[PDB]
Scaffold this active site. Structure first.
Site, PDB file in Angstrom:
ATOM      1  N   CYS A  14      42.135  41.721  42.284  1.00  0.00           N
ATOM      2  CA  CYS A  14      40.770  41.680  41.779  1.00  0.00           C
ATOM      3  C   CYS A  14      39.879  42.592  42.620  1.00  0.00           C
ATOM      4  CB  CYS A  14      40.219  40.259  41.816  1.00  0.00           C
ATOM      5  SG  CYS A  14      38.428  40.162  41.352  1.00  0.00           S
ATOM      6  N   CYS A  20      36.309  41.075  43.967  1.00  0.00           N
ATOM      7  CA  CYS A  20      36.464  40.244  45.147  1.00  0.00           C
ATOM      8  C   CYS A  20      36.900  41.009  46.390  1.00  0.00           C
ATOM      9  CB  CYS A  20      37.460  39.109  44.886  1.00  0.00           C
ATOM     10  SG  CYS A  20      36.997  37.932  43.559  1.00  0.00           S
TER      11      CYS A  20
END
Lengths: 173, 174, 174
Positions: free
Chosen positions: A128, A131
Protein backbone atom coordinates in the site's frame (compact mmCIF):
# COMPACT_ATOMS: atom_id res chain seq x y z
CA UNK A 1 17.35 -18.07 12.71
CA UNK A 2 19.71 -21.04 12.39
CA UNK A 3 16.69 -23.29 11.92
CA UNK A 4 15.00 -21.39 9.08
CA UNK A 5 18.31 -21.32 7.22
CA UNK A 6 18.98 -25.06 7.14
CA UNK A 7 15.31 -25.49 6.25
CA UNK A 8 15.69 -23.37 3.11
CA UNK A 9 16.03 -25.14 -0.26
CA UNK A 10 19.29 -25.08 -2.22
CA UNK A 11 17.89 -22.98 -5.06
CA UNK A 12 17.06 -20.38 -2.39
CA UNK A 13 20.68 -19.96 -1.28
CA UNK A 14 20.52 -16.21 -1.96
CA UNK A 15 17.65 -15.89 0.53
CA UNK A 16 19.49 -18.01 3.12
CA UNK A 17 22.51 -15.73 2.96
CA UNK A 18 20.47 -12.51 3.02
CA UNK A 19 18.73 -13.78 6.15
CA UNK A 20 22.05 -14.37 7.91
CA UNK A 21 23.10 -10.87 6.93
CA UNK A 22 19.99 -8.96 7.98
CA UNK A 23 20.23 -10.49 11.47
CA UNK A 24 23.54 -8.61 11.77
CA UNK A 25 22.12 -5.16 11.00
CA UNK A 26 24.12 -2.34 12.58
CA UNK A 27 21.88 0.52 11.48
CA UNK A 28 18.88 -0.79 13.42
CA UNK A 29 18.92 -1.56 17.14
CA UNK A 30 17.65 -4.72 18.83
CA UNK A 31 14.00 -3.69 19.18
CA UNK A 32 13.83 -2.03 15.76
CA UNK A 33 15.36 -5.01 13.93
CA UNK A 34 13.66 -7.86 15.73
CA UNK A 35 10.43 -5.91 15.88
CA UNK A 36 10.61 -5.51 12.11
CA UNK A 37 11.48 -9.18 11.64
CA UNK A 38 8.56 -10.28 13.82
CA UNK A 39 6.03 -7.96 12.20
CA UNK A 40 7.25 -8.92 8.72
CA UNK A 41 7.17 -12.60 9.64
CA UNK A 42 3.53 -12.22 10.67
CA UNK A 43 2.71 -10.26 7.50
CA UNK A 44 4.00 -13.10 5.26
CA UNK A 45 1.15 -15.16 6.70
CA UNK A 46 3.54 -18.13 6.79
CA UNK A 47 3.05 -20.03 10.09
CA UNK A 48 6.44 -21.76 9.96
CA UNK A 49 8.41 -18.53 9.54
CA UNK A 50 6.41 -16.72 12.23
CA UNK A 51 6.92 -19.58 14.69
CA UNK A 52 10.70 -19.69 14.13
CA UNK A 53 11.30 -15.93 14.13
CA UNK A 54 8.84 -15.25 16.92
CA UNK A 55 10.63 -17.80 19.08
CA UNK A 56 14.06 -16.18 18.89
CA UNK A 57 12.35 -12.80 19.16
CA UNK A 58 11.57 -13.59 22.80
CA UNK A 59 15.26 -13.12 23.57
CA UNK A 60 15.41 -9.70 21.90
CA UNK A 61 11.99 -8.16 22.55
CA UNK A 62 9.85 -7.55 25.62
CA UNK A 63 6.21 -8.58 26.02
CA UNK A 64 5.06 -5.07 25.13
CA UNK A 65 7.32 -4.90 22.07
CA UNK A 66 6.17 -8.32 20.87
CA UNK A 67 2.47 -7.45 21.09
CA UNK A 68 3.10 -4.11 19.41
CA UNK A 69 4.90 -5.81 16.52
CA UNK A 70 2.13 -8.36 15.96
CA UNK A 71 -0.45 -5.62 16.47
CA UNK A 72 1.27 -3.52 13.82
CA UNK A 73 0.91 -6.37 11.33
CA UNK A 74 -2.78 -6.77 12.17
CA UNK A 75 -3.71 -3.11 12.03
CA UNK A 76 -1.82 -2.59 8.75
CA UNK A 77 -3.57 -5.67 7.36
CA UNK A 78 -6.71 -3.52 7.50
CA UNK A 79 -5.23 -0.09 6.75
CA UNK A 80 -3.21 -1.30 3.77
CA UNK A 81 -6.41 -2.54 2.08
CA UNK A 82 -8.58 0.48 2.89
CA UNK A 83 -6.13 3.23 1.95
CA UNK A 84 -4.91 1.48 -1.18
CA UNK A 85 -8.51 1.15 -2.33
CA UNK A 86 -9.39 4.77 -1.69
CA UNK A 87 -6.13 5.60 -3.46
CA UNK A 88 -7.20 3.79 -6.63
CA UNK A 89 -10.44 5.79 -6.67
CA UNK A 90 -8.50 9.02 -7.27
CA UNK A 91 -9.62 10.90 -4.16
CA UNK A 92 -13.27 10.57 -5.18
CA UNK A 93 -14.07 9.07 -1.77
CA UNK A 94 -11.82 11.25 0.38
CA UNK A 95 -14.78 13.36 1.53
CA UNK A 96 -16.09 10.39 3.52
CA UNK A 97 -14.93 9.48 7.01
CA UNK A 98 -13.29 6.01 7.14
CA UNK A 99 -14.82 5.44 10.55
CA UNK A 100 -12.13 2.84 11.26
CA UNK A 101 -10.81 2.43 14.80
CA UNK A 102 -7.01 2.33 15.07
CA UNK A 103 -6.05 3.49 18.56
CA UNK A 104 -3.02 1.20 18.63
CA UNK A 105 -1.26 3.59 16.25
CA UNK A 106 -1.59 6.45 18.75
CA UNK A 107 -0.79 4.23 21.74
CA UNK A 108 1.16 1.09 20.68
CA UNK A 109 2.52 0.49 24.16
CA UNK A 110 6.06 1.38 23.06
CA UNK A 111 7.90 4.29 21.37
CA UNK A 112 5.80 5.22 18.35
CA UNK A 113 9.00 5.53 16.31
CA UNK A 114 9.43 1.76 16.45
CA UNK A 115 5.75 1.10 15.80
CA UNK A 116 5.95 3.33 12.73
CA UNK A 117 8.99 1.41 11.44
CA UNK A 118 7.14 -1.88 11.83
CA UNK A 119 4.05 -0.43 10.11
CA UNK A 120 6.26 0.85 7.29
CA UNK A 121 7.66 -2.67 6.90
CA UNK A 122 4.25 -4.39 6.78
CA UNK A 123 2.97 -1.80 4.30
CA UNK A 124 5.75 -2.81 1.89
CA UNK A 125 4.78 -6.46 2.19
CA UNK A 126 1.05 -5.85 1.68
CA UNK A 127 1.69 -3.25 -0.99
CA UNK A 128 0.00 0.00 0.00
CA UNK A 129 1.57 3.19 -1.30
CA UNK A 130 -0.51 5.59 0.80
CA UNK A 131 0.52 3.92 4.04
CA UNK A 132 4.15 3.27 3.21
CA UNK A 133 4.61 6.90 2.16
CA UNK A 134 2.73 8.13 5.25
CA UNK A 135 4.76 6.10 7.72
CA UNK A 136 8.00 6.97 5.92
CA UNK A 137 7.33 10.68 6.37
CA UNK A 138 6.44 10.19 10.05
CA UNK A 139 9.67 8.27 10.68
CA UNK A 140 11.67 11.04 9.00
CA UNK A 141 10.02 13.65 11.23
CA UNK A 142 10.95 11.82 14.43
CA UNK A 143 14.62 11.65 13.50
CA UNK A 144 14.91 8.23 11.84
CA UNK A 145 17.48 8.14 9.00
CA UNK A 146 16.69 6.93 5.48
CA UNK A 147 19.35 4.25 5.99
CA UNK A 148 17.38 2.95 8.97
CA UNK A 149 14.09 2.98 7.09
CA UNK A 150 15.82 1.38 4.11
CA UNK A 151 17.11 -1.38 6.39
CA UNK A 152 13.52 -2.10 7.47
CA UNK A 153 12.43 -2.45 3.83
CA UNK A 154 15.27 -4.90 3.20
CA UNK A 155 14.35 -7.01 6.24
CA UNK A 156 10.70 -7.12 5.16
CA UNK A 157 11.66 -8.18 1.66
CA UNK A 158 14.08 -10.83 2.92
CA UNK A 159 11.58 -12.35 5.35
CA UNK A 160 9.10 -12.43 2.46
CA UNK A 161 11.63 -14.38 0.42
CA UNK A 162 12.09 -16.81 3.30
CA UNK A 163 8.36 -17.42 3.71
CA UNK A 164 7.97 -18.06 -0.02
CA UNK A 165 10.97 -20.39 -0.14
CA UNK A 166 9.72 -22.38 2.86
CA UNK A 167 6.06 -22.60 1.87
CA UNK A 168 7.24 -24.18 -1.36
CA UNK A 169 9.32 -27.10 -0.13
CA UNK A 170 6.90 -27.59 2.76
CA UNK A 171 4.10 -28.23 0.26
CA UNK A 172 6.35 -30.40 -1.92
CA UNK A 173 7.67 -32.57 0.92
CA UNK B 1 -22.58 -12.30 15.04
CA UNK B 2 -19.48 -14.46 14.42
CA UNK B 3 -18.50 -14.24 18.08
CA UNK B 4 -16.02 -17.08 17.54
CA UNK B 5 -13.73 -14.83 15.48
CA UNK B 6 -14.13 -11.85 17.80
CA UNK B 7 -13.50 -13.89 20.94
CA UNK B 8 -10.41 -15.48 19.39
CA UNK B 9 -8.86 -12.14 18.46
CA UNK B 10 -5.79 -11.15 20.52
CA UNK B 11 -5.80 -8.25 22.97
CA UNK B 12 -3.37 -6.26 20.80
CA UNK B 13 -5.99 -6.44 18.04
CA UNK B 14 -8.81 -4.80 20.01
CA UNK B 15 -9.26 -2.23 17.23
CA UNK B 16 -9.87 -5.01 14.71
CA UNK B 17 -12.42 -6.66 17.01
CA UNK B 18 -14.33 -3.44 17.54
CA UNK B 19 -14.35 -2.78 13.80
CA UNK B 20 -15.69 -6.27 13.09
CA UNK B 21 -18.59 -5.86 15.54
CA UNK B 22 -19.41 -2.49 14.03
CA UNK B 23 -19.28 -3.52 10.37
CA UNK B 24 -21.67 -6.42 11.04
CA UNK B 25 -24.23 -3.90 12.31
CA UNK B 26 -24.13 -0.92 9.94
CA UNK B 27 -27.33 0.26 8.33
CA UNK B 28 -25.64 1.20 5.06
CA UNK B 29 -25.72 -2.29 3.55
CA UNK B 30 -28.61 -4.75 3.69
CA UNK B 31 -28.23 -8.43 4.56
CA UNK B 32 -27.32 -9.76 1.10
CA UNK B 33 -25.06 -6.81 0.31
CA UNK B 34 -23.20 -7.15 3.64
CA UNK B 35 -22.91 -10.92 4.04
CA UNK B 36 -22.05 -11.44 0.39
CA UNK B 37 -19.23 -8.99 1.00
CA UNK B 38 -18.06 -10.67 4.21
CA UNK B 39 -18.08 -14.10 2.57
CA UNK B 40 -16.23 -13.04 -0.59
CA UNK B 41 -13.74 -11.03 1.50
CA UNK B 42 -13.17 -13.93 3.88
CA UNK B 43 -12.35 -16.23 0.95
CA UNK B 44 -10.04 -13.58 -0.54
CA UNK B 45 -7.92 -13.36 2.64
CA UNK B 46 -7.09 -17.04 2.09
CA UNK B 47 -7.50 -17.53 5.87
CA UNK B 48 -9.44 -20.79 6.43
CA UNK B 49 -10.51 -19.99 9.99
CA UNK B 50 -12.13 -16.68 9.05
CA UNK B 51 -13.85 -18.27 6.05
CA UNK B 52 -14.98 -21.34 7.99
CA UNK B 53 -16.68 -19.21 10.67
CA UNK B 54 -18.22 -16.57 8.43
CA UNK B 55 -19.30 -19.34 6.07
CA UNK B 56 -21.02 -21.21 8.92
CA UNK B 57 -23.28 -18.27 9.70
CA UNK B 58 -23.60 -17.04 6.11
CA UNK B 59 -26.10 -19.84 5.54
CA UNK B 60 -28.59 -17.87 7.65
CA UNK B 61 -28.11 -14.64 5.67
CA UNK B 62 -27.65 -15.82 2.08
CA UNK B 63 -29.32 -18.22 -0.32
CA UNK B 64 -27.30 -21.00 -1.92
CA UNK B 65 -27.12 -18.96 -5.15
CA UNK B 66 -25.90 -15.88 -3.24
CA UNK B 67 -23.22 -17.90 -1.43
CA UNK B 68 -22.00 -19.52 -4.65
CA UNK B 69 -21.98 -16.13 -6.38
CA UNK B 70 -19.97 -14.58 -3.54
CA UNK B 71 -17.44 -17.41 -3.54
CA UNK B 72 -17.33 -17.29 -7.34
CA UNK B 73 -16.64 -13.55 -7.28
CA UNK B 74 -13.56 -14.31 -5.19
CA UNK B 75 -12.38 -17.04 -7.57
CA UNK B 76 -12.90 -15.03 -10.75
CA UNK B 77 -11.31 -11.87 -9.31
CA UNK B 78 -8.38 -14.02 -8.19
CA UNK B 79 -7.65 -14.43 -11.89
CA UNK B 80 -8.82 -11.01 -13.18
CA UNK B 81 -7.00 -9.06 -10.47
CA UNK B 82 -3.70 -10.62 -11.60
CA UNK B 83 -4.26 -10.31 -15.36
CA UNK B 84 -5.59 -6.74 -15.53
CA UNK B 85 -3.12 -5.39 -12.97
CA UNK B 86 -0.25 -6.86 -14.96
CA UNK B 87 -1.64 -5.33 -18.12
CA UNK B 88 -1.90 -1.97 -16.36
CA UNK B 89 1.70 -2.04 -15.20
CA UNK B 90 2.66 -2.47 -18.85
CA UNK B 91 1.05 0.85 -19.82
CA UNK B 92 -1.49 -0.56 -22.28
CA UNK B 93 1.41 -2.02 -24.28
CA UNK B 94 -0.64 -5.23 -24.44
CA UNK B 95 -4.18 -3.85 -24.60
CA UNK B 96 -4.55 -4.66 -28.30
CA UNK B 97 -4.29 -8.38 -27.54
CA UNK B 98 -7.41 -10.46 -26.87
CA UNK B 99 -7.26 -11.77 -23.28
CA UNK B 100 -9.14 -14.92 -24.22
CA UNK B 101 -10.03 -15.48 -20.58
CA UNK B 102 -13.48 -16.97 -19.98
CA UNK B 103 -15.48 -15.16 -17.30
CA UNK B 104 -19.16 -15.97 -17.91
CA UNK B 105 -19.97 -15.73 -14.20
CA UNK B 106 -19.57 -11.96 -14.41
CA UNK B 107 -22.38 -11.65 -16.97
CA UNK B 108 -24.53 -14.32 -15.30
CA UNK B 109 -23.70 -14.66 -11.58
CA UNK B 110 -27.13 -16.10 -10.78
CA UNK B 111 -28.14 -13.13 -8.64
CA UNK B 112 -28.61 -9.34 -9.00
CA UNK B 113 -25.49 -8.00 -10.72
CA UNK B 114 -25.47 -5.05 -8.31
CA UNK B 115 -24.47 -7.45 -5.54
CA UNK B 116 -22.00 -9.53 -7.58
CA UNK B 117 -20.29 -6.32 -8.61
CA UNK B 118 -20.16 -5.12 -5.00
CA UNK B 119 -18.48 -8.35 -3.97
CA UNK B 120 -16.07 -8.33 -6.92
CA UNK B 121 -15.19 -4.75 -5.91
CA UNK B 122 -14.43 -5.86 -2.35
CA UNK B 123 -12.20 -8.71 -3.48
CA UNK B 124 -10.43 -6.38 -5.93
CA UNK B 125 -9.59 -4.15 -2.98
CA UNK B 126 -8.12 -7.07 -1.08
CA UNK B 127 -5.96 -8.36 -3.96
CA UNK B 128 -5.07 -4.82 -4.95
CA UNK B 129 -5.92 -4.29 -8.61
CA UNK B 130 -6.66 -0.71 -9.58
CA UNK B 131 -8.08 -1.58 -12.98
CA UNK B 132 -10.62 -3.98 -11.53
CA UNK B 133 -11.51 -1.78 -8.55
CA UNK B 134 -12.12 1.22 -10.80
CA UNK B 135 -14.09 -0.82 -13.33
CA UNK B 136 -16.40 -2.39 -10.75
CA UNK B 137 -16.91 0.91 -8.89
CA UNK B 138 -18.05 2.41 -12.18
CA UNK B 139 -20.42 -0.47 -12.93
CA UNK B 140 -21.83 -0.17 -9.41
CA UNK B 141 -22.57 3.51 -10.01
CA UNK B 142 -24.25 2.78 -13.34
CA UNK B 143 -26.60 0.34 -11.59
CA UNK B 144 -27.59 2.93 -8.98
CA UNK B 145 -25.60 1.59 -6.01
CA UNK B 146 -25.25 4.12 -3.18
CA UNK B 147 -21.77 5.70 -3.19
CA UNK B 148 -21.64 5.08 0.56
CA UNK B 149 -22.52 1.42 0.08
CA UNK B 150 -19.48 0.96 -2.15
CA UNK B 151 -17.43 2.71 0.52
CA UNK B 152 -18.90 0.43 3.18
CA UNK B 153 -17.85 -2.62 1.14
CA UNK B 154 -14.29 -1.32 0.99
CA UNK B 155 -14.29 -0.88 4.76
CA UNK B 156 -15.68 -4.37 5.23
CA UNK B 157 -13.01 -5.90 3.00
CA UNK B 158 -10.28 -4.04 4.89
CA UNK B 159 -11.67 -5.13 8.26
CA UNK B 160 -11.95 -8.79 7.30
CA UNK B 161 -8.32 -8.56 6.08
CA UNK B 162 -7.23 -7.37 9.52
CA UNK B 163 -9.17 -10.18 11.14
CA UNK B 164 -7.45 -12.73 8.90
CA UNK B 165 -4.02 -11.32 9.67
CA UNK B 166 -4.75 -11.10 13.39
CA UNK B 167 -5.99 -14.70 13.65
CA UNK B 168 -3.39 -16.17 11.31
CA UNK B 169 -0.71 -15.00 13.73
CA UNK B 170 -2.24 -16.59 16.83
CA UNK B 171 -2.87 -19.89 15.05
CA UNK B 172 0.84 -20.03 14.15
CA UNK B 173 1.83 -19.35 17.76
CA UNK B 174 -0.79 -21.56 19.42
CA UNK C 1 -2.98 -34.26 -12.39
CA UNK C 2 -4.61 -31.31 -14.18
CA UNK C 3 -7.79 -33.40 -14.21
CA UNK C 4 -7.54 -33.73 -10.43
CA UNK C 5 -7.34 -29.95 -10.03
CA UNK C 6 -10.19 -29.45 -12.49
CA UNK C 7 -12.49 -31.98 -10.83
CA UNK C 8 -11.84 -30.35 -7.46
CA UNK C 9 -13.04 -26.95 -8.70
CA UNK C 10 -16.61 -26.08 -7.63
CA UNK C 11 -19.40 -25.53 -10.16
CA UNK C 12 -19.48 -21.78 -9.55
CA UNK C 13 -15.85 -21.74 -10.69
CA UNK C 14 -16.51 -23.28 -14.10
CA UNK C 15 -14.74 -20.37 -15.84
CA UNK C 16 -11.54 -21.17 -13.94
CA UNK C 17 -11.77 -24.86 -14.86
CA UNK C 18 -12.15 -24.06 -18.56
CA UNK C 19 -9.30 -21.55 -18.58
CA UNK C 20 -7.01 -24.11 -16.95
CA UNK C 21 -7.84 -26.67 -19.66
CA UNK C 22 -7.22 -24.07 -22.36
CA UNK C 23 -3.91 -22.75 -20.97
CA UNK C 24 -2.55 -26.27 -20.51
CA UNK C 25 -3.49 -27.05 -24.13
CA UNK C 26 -1.60 -23.93 -25.24
CA UNK C 27 0.85 -24.25 -28.11
CA UNK C 28 2.31 -20.76 -27.68
CA UNK C 29 4.86 -21.75 -25.04
CA UNK C 30 6.66 -25.10 -25.22
CA UNK C 31 6.61 -27.71 -22.43
CA UNK C 32 9.41 -26.21 -20.34
CA UNK C 33 8.24 -22.61 -20.73
CA UNK C 34 4.60 -23.48 -19.99
CA UNK C 35 5.13 -25.87 -17.11
CA UNK C 36 7.86 -23.70 -15.68
CA UNK C 37 5.36 -20.84 -15.70
CA UNK C 38 2.63 -23.01 -14.12
CA UNK C 39 4.98 -24.33 -11.43
CA UNK C 40 6.51 -20.97 -10.53
CA UNK C 41 3.00 -19.47 -10.48
CA UNK C 42 1.62 -22.23 -8.28
CA UNK C 43 4.41 -21.68 -5.74
CA UNK C 44 3.69 -17.92 -5.78
CA UNK C 45 -0.01 -18.43 -4.90
CA UNK C 46 1.10 -19.98 -1.59
CA UNK C 47 -1.56 -22.68 -2.02
CA UNK C 48 0.08 -26.00 -1.05
CA UNK C 49 -2.49 -28.22 -2.77
CA UNK C 50 -2.16 -26.48 -6.13
CA UNK C 51 1.63 -26.48 -5.97
CA UNK C 52 1.62 -30.18 -5.10
CA UNK C 53 -0.65 -31.10 -8.04
CA UNK C 54 1.13 -28.90 -10.60
CA UNK C 55 4.53 -30.04 -9.35
CA UNK C 56 3.45 -33.66 -9.76
CA UNK C 57 2.59 -33.31 -13.44
CA UNK C 58 5.41 -30.85 -14.11
CA UNK C 59 7.90 -33.67 -13.54
CA UNK C 60 7.04 -35.02 -16.97
CA UNK C 61 7.56 -31.68 -18.69
CA UNK C 62 10.48 -30.14 -16.81
CA UNK C 63 14.12 -31.12 -16.33
CA UNK C 64 15.61 -31.06 -12.84
CA UNK C 65 17.45 -27.84 -13.70
CA UNK C 66 14.33 -26.13 -15.07
CA UNK C 67 12.28 -27.24 -12.06
CA UNK C 68 14.89 -25.86 -9.65
CA UNK C 69 15.06 -22.64 -11.67
CA UNK C 70 11.30 -22.10 -11.62
CA UNK C 71 10.97 -22.66 -7.88
CA UNK C 72 14.06 -20.50 -7.43
CA UNK C 73 12.45 -17.73 -9.48
CA UNK C 74 9.39 -17.74 -7.22
CA UNK C 75 11.63 -17.54 -4.13
CA UNK C 76 13.90 -14.76 -5.38
CA UNK C 77 10.97 -12.69 -6.70
CA UNK C 78 9.31 -13.12 -3.31
CA UNK C 79 12.04 -10.89 -1.92
CA UNK C 80 12.60 -8.62 -4.92
CA UNK C 81 8.89 -7.94 -5.50
CA UNK C 82 8.53 -6.52 -1.96
CA UNK C 83 11.81 -4.56 -1.99
CA UNK C 84 11.34 -2.89 -5.37
CA UNK C 85 7.63 -2.32 -4.81
CA UNK C 86 8.25 -0.47 -1.56
CA UNK C 87 11.14 1.48 -3.08
CA UNK C 88 8.90 2.29 -6.02
CA UNK C 89 6.26 3.91 -3.82
CA UNK C 90 8.95 6.34 -2.62
CA UNK C 91 9.22 7.73 -6.16
CA UNK C 92 12.98 7.32 -6.48
CA UNK C 93 13.79 9.04 -3.20
CA UNK C 94 15.54 5.83 -2.14
CA UNK C 95 16.99 4.85 -5.53
CA UNK C 96 20.49 6.07 -4.59
CA UNK C 97 20.93 3.56 -1.78
CA UNK C 98 22.62 0.22 -2.44
CA UNK C 99 20.14 -2.66 -1.95
CA UNK C 100 22.87 -5.00 -0.76
CA UNK C 101 20.65 -7.97 -1.51
CA UNK C 102 22.24 -11.12 -2.90
CA UNK C 103 20.44 -12.45 -6.01
CA UNK C 104 23.05 -14.63 -7.70
CA UNK C 105 20.42 -17.03 -9.07
CA UNK C 106 19.25 -14.28 -11.41
CA UNK C 107 22.63 -14.17 -13.17
CA UNK C 108 23.16 -17.93 -12.91
CA UNK C 109 19.84 -19.86 -12.69
CA UNK C 110 21.29 -23.09 -14.10
CA UNK C 111 19.48 -22.78 -17.43
CA UNK C 112 19.47 -20.22 -20.29
CA UNK C 113 18.09 -16.97 -18.82
CA UNK C 114 15.21 -16.27 -21.22
CA UNK C 115 12.92 -18.89 -19.66
CA UNK C 116 13.98 -17.96 -16.12
CA UNK C 117 13.04 -14.38 -16.91
CA UNK C 118 9.66 -15.48 -18.27
CA UNK C 119 8.90 -17.18 -14.94
CA UNK C 120 10.20 -14.21 -12.93
CA UNK C 121 7.80 -12.03 -14.95
CA UNK C 122 4.97 -14.42 -14.08
CA UNK C 123 5.64 -14.40 -10.38
CA UNK C 124 5.97 -10.58 -10.39
CA UNK C 125 2.47 -10.36 -11.86
CA UNK C 126 1.06 -12.58 -9.13
CA UNK C 127 2.75 -10.65 -6.31
CA UNK C 128 1.96 -7.38 -8.03
CA UNK C 129 5.18 -5.41 -8.38
CA UNK C 130 5.20 -2.87 -11.18
CA UNK C 131 8.96 -2.31 -11.09
CA UNK C 132 9.85 -5.98 -11.44
CA UNK C 133 7.09 -6.76 -13.97
CA UNK C 134 8.21 -3.88 -16.18
CA UNK C 135 11.87 -4.80 -15.84
CA UNK C 136 11.46 -8.47 -16.63
CA UNK C 137 9.23 -7.72 -19.59
CA UNK C 138 11.80 -5.32 -21.04
CA UNK C 139 14.61 -7.84 -20.59
CA UNK C 140 12.50 -10.51 -22.31
CA UNK C 141 11.93 -8.21 -25.28
CA UNK C 142 15.65 -7.45 -25.50
CA UNK C 143 16.54 -11.16 -25.64
CA UNK C 144 14.12 -11.91 -28.46
CA UNK C 145 11.02 -13.10 -26.57
CA UNK C 146 7.88 -11.88 -28.36
CA UNK C 147 4.73 -10.38 -26.84
CA UNK C 148 2.53 -13.36 -27.60
CA UNK C 149 4.71 -15.56 -25.37
CA UNK C 150 4.98 -12.96 -22.58
CA UNK C 151 1.21 -12.46 -22.79
CA UNK C 152 0.62 -16.22 -22.52
CA UNK C 153 2.78 -16.26 -19.39
CA UNK C 154 0.69 -13.45 -17.85
CA UNK C 155 -2.51 -15.38 -18.65
CA UNK C 156 -1.16 -18.60 -17.13
CA UNK C 157 -0.13 -16.72 -13.99
CA UNK C 158 -3.61 -15.23 -13.64
CA UNK C 159 -5.37 -18.57 -14.26
CA UNK C 160 -3.22 -20.44 -11.75
CA UNK C 161 -4.03 -17.67 -9.27
CA UNK C 162 -7.75 -18.19 -9.87
CA UNK C 163 -7.35 -21.93 -9.34
CA UNK C 164 -5.52 -21.46 -6.04
CA UNK C 165 -8.25 -19.15 -4.77
CA UNK C 166 -11.12 -21.47 -5.76
CA UNK C 167 -9.39 -24.48 -4.20
CA UNK C 168 -8.38 -22.70 -1.00
CA UNK C 169 -12.02 -21.83 -0.47
CA UNK C 170 -13.40 -25.37 -0.78
CA UNK C 171 -10.54 -26.77 1.31
CA UNK C 172 -11.44 -24.42 4.17
CA UNK C 173 -15.17 -25.07 3.74
CA UNK C 174 -14.81 -28.86 3.83
Amino acid sequence: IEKLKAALPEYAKDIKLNLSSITRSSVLDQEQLWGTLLASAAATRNPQVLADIGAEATDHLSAAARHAALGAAAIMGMNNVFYRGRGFLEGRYDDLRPGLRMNIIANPGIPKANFELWSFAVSAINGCSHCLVAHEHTLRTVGVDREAIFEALKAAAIVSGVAQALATIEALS
